[PDB]
Amino acid sequence: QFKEGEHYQVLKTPASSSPVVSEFFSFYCPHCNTFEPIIAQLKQQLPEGAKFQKNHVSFMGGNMGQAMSKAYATMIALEVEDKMVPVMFNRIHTLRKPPKDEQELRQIFLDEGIDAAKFDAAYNGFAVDSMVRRFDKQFQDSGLTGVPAVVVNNRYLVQGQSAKSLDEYFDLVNYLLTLK
Ligand SMILES: C[C@H](CCC(=O)NCCS(=O)(=O)O)[C@H]1CC[C@H]2[C@@H]3[C@H](O)C[C@@H]4C[C@H](O)CC[C@]4(C)[C@H]3C[C@H](O)[C@]12C
């Protein structure tokens, strides 16, 4: 069914050690916003033992892009992705009130009930710094040129504009998870 060059491209990076689906996104990206409920269904139907990893990119949002990457990494660090990922998309794309500075970015978390001391320790901490650097290294090493992008096993770039239903898009990802 699924064919190289048509349904996916092989990237220059080496294959991952264990099965993983990696999404590269930005909270500033409208298509990433549209994609988020689709991602939520992809995750629910992934084969047992396959990991899913969202990676935020810093090149949208002007001088707030890197701060927003740290914000996403903070959602991972604090284990509040289920609450904060839809909140942040909604703030930028429905309310259309993107944060003008880091104070407003922090306030978006506080206004959802995140503890201020826990946010401050995470946002400026080593785990978040390490995760943002990893977002960036993967994006650079993979030769990615934009978002959204979905990479399977560190090496197979999905061409979503090949699927003819949501179920077929899922079949393509699941097939790629079996490649080395
Ligand atoms: C779930 C698919 C991809 C989701 C997405 O947001 N793309 C980005 C992912 S990626 O970075 O390209 O991997 C989308 C992309 C193309 C979509 C199809 C096309 O839009 C064409 C039709 C449109 C109809 O309204 C619904 C069926 C459909 C046949 C769509 C089903 C589904 O929504 C598809 C298959």
Coordinates of C-alpha atoms and ligand atoms in Angstrom, one line a residue:
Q1 CA 0.0 0.0 0.0
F2 CA 2.3 2.7 1.3
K3 CA 5.3 3.6 -0.9
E4 CA 8.5 5.6 -0.4
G5 CA 8.5 8.9 -2.1
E6 CA 4.7 8.9 -2.2
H7 CA 3.5 8.3 1.4
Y8 CA 6.7 9.1 3.3
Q9 CA 10.3 10.3 2.8
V10 CA 13.3 8.7 4.3
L11 CA 15.3 11.2 6.4
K12 CA 19.1 11.4 6.8
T13 CA 19.0 10.6 10.5
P14 CA 19.4 7.0 11.8
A15 CA 16.5 5.0 13.0
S16 CA 15.5 5.1 16.6
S17 CA 16.2 2.3 19.1
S18 CA 12.5 1.8 20.0
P19 CA 9.3 2.7 18.2
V20 CA 8.4 6.3 18.4
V21 CA 6.1 8.8 16.6
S22 CA 7.5 12.4 16.8
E23 CA 5.4 15.4 16.0
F24 CA 7.0 18.8 15.4
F25 CA 4.6 21.6 16.0
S26 CA 4.2 25.2 17.2
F27 CA 1.4 26.6 19.3
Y28 CA 1.5 29.5 16.8
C29 CA 0.7 27.3 13.8
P30 CA -3.0 27.2 12.8
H31 CA -2.6 23.8 11.1
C32 CA -1.0 22.4 14.2
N33 CA -4.1 23.6 16.1
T34 CA -6.4 21.9 13.6
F35 CA -4.2 18.8 13.8
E36 CA -4.3 18.6 17.6
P37 CA -7.6 16.6 17.9
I38 CA -6.3 14.2 15.1
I39 CA -3.1 13.7 17.1
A40 CA -5.2 12.9 20.2
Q41 CA -6.9 10.1 18.2
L42 CA -3.6 8.9 16.7
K43 CA -2.2 8.5 20.1
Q44 CA -5.2 6.5 21.5
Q45 CA -4.9 3.9 18.7
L46 CA -1.1 3.5 18.6
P47 CA 0.3 0.0 18.9
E48 CA 1.1 -1.0 22.4
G49 CA 4.7 0.0 23.3
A50 CA 5.0 2.8 20.7
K51 CA 5.9 6.2 22.2
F52 CA 4.5 9.5 21.0
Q53 CA 6.6 12.6 21.5
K54 CA 5.5 16.2 20.7
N55 CA 8.4 18.6 20.0
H56 CA 7.9 22.4 19.9
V57 CA 9.8 24.5 17.4
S58 CA 11.0 28.1 18.1
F59 CA 10.8 29.7 14.7
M60 CA 7.2 31.0 14.8
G61 CA 6.0 33.7 17.2
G62 CA 8.8 36.2 16.7
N63 CA 10.8 37.1 19.8
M64 CA 8.4 34.8 21.8
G65 CA 9.1 31.6 19.9
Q66 CA 11.9 30.3 22.2
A67 CA 9.8 31.2 25.3
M68 CA 6.9 29.3 23.9
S69 CA 9.1 26.2 23.4
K70 CA 10.1 26.5 27.0
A71 CA 6.4 26.8 27.9
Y72 CA 5.7 23.5 26.1
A73 CA 8.6 21.8 27.8
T74 CA 7.3 23.2 31.1
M75 CA 3.9 21.5 30.4
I76 CA 5.9 18.2 30.1
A77 CA 7.9 18.9 33.2
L78 CA 4.9 19.7 35.3
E79 CA 2.7 16.9 33.7
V80 CA 0.0 19.3 32.8
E81 CA -0.1 18.8 29.0
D82 CA -3.7 17.6 29.0
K83 CA -4.9 20.8 30.5
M84 CA -2.4 23.3 29.1
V85 CA -2.0 22.2 25.5
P86 CA -5.6 23.0 24.5
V87 CA -5.6 26.1 26.6
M88 CA -2.5 27.5 24.8
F89 CA -3.9 26.7 21.4
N90 CA -7.2 28.3 22.3
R91 CA -5.5 31.4 23.7
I92 CA -3.6 32.0 20.5
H93 CA -6.1 30.9 17.8
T94 CA -9.6 31.4 19.2
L95 CA -9.1 34.2 21.7
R96 CA -6.3 35.6 19.5
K97 CA -4.5 37.0 22.4
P98 CA -1.0 35.6 22.1
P99 CA 1.3 36.5 25.0
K100 CA 3.3 39.6 24.4
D101 CA 6.0 38.9 26.9
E102 CA 7.1 36.2 29.3
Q103 CA 5.0 37.7 32.1
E104 CA 1.8 37.1 30.0
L105 CA 3.1 33.7 29.0
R106 CA 3.5 32.8 32.7
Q107 CA 0.1 34.2 33.5
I108 CA -1.6 31.9 31.0
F109 CA -0.4 29.0 33.3
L110 CA -1.3 30.7 36.5
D111 CA -4.8 31.5 35.3
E112 CA -5.4 27.7 34.9
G113 CA -4.3 27.0 38.4
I114 CA -0.6 26.0 37.9
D115 CA 1.4 26.7 41.1
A116 CA 3.6 29.8 40.6
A117 CA 6.5 28.4 42.5
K118 CA 6.4 25.1 40.6
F119 CA 6.1 27.0 37.3
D120 CA 9.1 29.2 38.0
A121 CA 11.3 26.3 39.1
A122 CA 10.5 24.4 35.9
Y123 CA 10.4 27.1 33.3
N124 CA 14.0 28.3 34.3
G125 CA 15.2 24.8 35.2
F126 CA 17.6 22.2 33.7
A127 CA 15.0 19.7 32.5
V128 CA 13.1 22.3 30.4
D129 CA 16.4 23.7 29.1
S130 CA 17.5 20.1 28.1
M131 CA 14.1 19.3 26.4
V132 CA 14.1 22.5 24.3
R133 CA 17.7 21.8 23.2
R134 CA 16.5 18.3 22.2
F135 CA 13.5 19.7 20.3
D136 CA 15.9 21.8 18.3
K137 CA 18.6 19.2 17.8
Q138 CA 16.1 16.7 16.3
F139 CA 14.6 19.4 14.1
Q140 CA 18.0 20.4 12.8
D141 CA 19.4 16.9 12.5
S142 CA 16.3 15.7 10.6
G143 CA 16.5 18.4 8.0
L144 CA 12.9 19.4 8.6
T145 CA 11.7 22.5 6.8
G146 CA 8.5 23.4 8.6
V147 CA 5.6 22.3 10.8
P148 CA 3.5 20.3 11.2
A149 CA 5.8 17.4 10.6
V150 CA 5.5 13.8 11.8
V151 CA 8.6 11.6 11.9
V152 CA 8.4 7.9 12.7
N153 CA 11.4 6.1 14.3
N154 CA 13.5 9.2 13.9
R155 CA 13.8 8.5 10.1
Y156 CA 10.5 8.3 8.3
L157 CA 8.8 11.6 7.4
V158 CA 5.0 11.2 6.9
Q159 CA 3.4 12.8 3.9
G160 CA -0.1 13.3 5.3
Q161 CA -1.3 14.7 1.9
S162 CA -1.4 11.0 0.9
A163 CA -4.1 9.6 3.2
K164 CA -7.7 9.5 2.0
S165 CA -9.2 9.2 5.5
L166 CA -8.2 9.6 9.1
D167 CA -8.2 5.8 9.4
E168 CA -5.7 5.5 6.5
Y169 CA -3.5 8.2 7.9
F170 CA -3.3 6.1 11.1
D171 CA -2.5 2.9 9.0
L172 CA 0.5 4.7 7.4
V173 CA 2.0 5.8 10.8
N174 CA 1.4 2.2 12.2
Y175 CA 3.1 0.7 9.2
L176 CA 6.1 3.1 9.5
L177 CA 6.5 2.0 13.1
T178 CA 7.6 -1.5 11.9
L179 CA 10.5 -0.1 9.9
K180 CA 14.1 0.1 11.0
Ligands
LIG1 C1 -5.7 13.2 8.9 C2 -4.9 13.7 7.7 C3 -3.7 14.5 8.1 C4 -4.0 15.5 9.3 C5 -3.3 16.8 9.2 O1 -3.7 17.7 9.8 N1 -2.2 16.8 8.4 C6 -0.9 17.2 8.9 C7 -0.1 15.9 9.3 S1 1.5 15.8 8.4 O2 2.4 16.7 9.0 O3 1.2 16.0 7.0 O4 1.9 14.4 8.7 C8 -5.8 14.5 6.7 C9 -5.0 15.2 5.6 C10 -5.7 15.1 4.3 C11 -7.1 14.9 4.8 C12 -8.2 14.5 3.8 C13 -8.4 15.7 2.8 O5 -8.5 16.9 3.5 C14 -9.5 15.4 1.8 C15 -10.8 15.0 2.4 C16 -11.7 16.1 3.0 C17 -13.0 15.7 3.6 O6 -13.6 16.8 4.3 C18 -12.7 14.6 4.7 C19 -12.0 13.4 4.0 C20 -10.6 13.8 3.4 C21 -10.2 12.5 2.6 C22 -9.5 14.2 4.4 C23 -9.4 13.2 5.6 C24 -8.3 13.6 6.6 O7 -8.7 14.8 7.3 C25 -6.9 13.8 5.9 C26 -6.4 12.5 5.4

